[PDB]
Nucleic acid binder design. Structure first.
Length: 118
RNA sequence: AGCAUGGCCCCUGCACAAGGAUGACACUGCG
């Protein structure tokens, strides 16, 4: 009953159920989301890799960029894999130490899924 | 899939704050 991770993030796979019309539009939704926020990504087979060096989708990030700030970046690096298995969209966190960037990306992705579907 | 704690995506906001909305959530505590 060891606890060497008594406060580490214990959720690393995020899943979203997808109806037929989501399953059909998942590709255009994903491309829009990723390219409208300038998010680096590449195809690694049946899987997408996202490698970010800084948060670029946050409202805070928009405030920092659209404003001339002394530091024009909110850094924090993270890698994650996007997949579709069993009519579910999965995002697995595969690299990084800051969980908040990965959960921030997940929250924005979830918002994208609710918006471009309704 | 309760209550507390917390942050996340979105809105207001020069910064720090403080709100608002909302859905997906989560470290641990009551247990």
């Amino acid at each position: 009953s060891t606890s060497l991770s008594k406060y580490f993030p214990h959720k690393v796979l995020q899943n979203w159920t997808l109806d037929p019309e989501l399953c059909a539009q998942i590709d255009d939704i994903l491309q829009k989301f990723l390219d409208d926020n300038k998010i680096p990504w590449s195809k690694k087979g049946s899987v997408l890799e996202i490698s970010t060096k800084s948060i670029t989708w946050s409202r805070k990030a928009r405030r920092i960029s659209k404003s001339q700030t002394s530091v024009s970046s909110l850094e924090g690096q993270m890698k994650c894999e996007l997949n579709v298995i069993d009519n579910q969209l999965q995002c697995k966190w595969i690299e990084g130490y800051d969980y908040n960037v990965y959960e921030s990306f997940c929250s924005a992705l979830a918002r994208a899924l609710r918006d471009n579907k309704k």
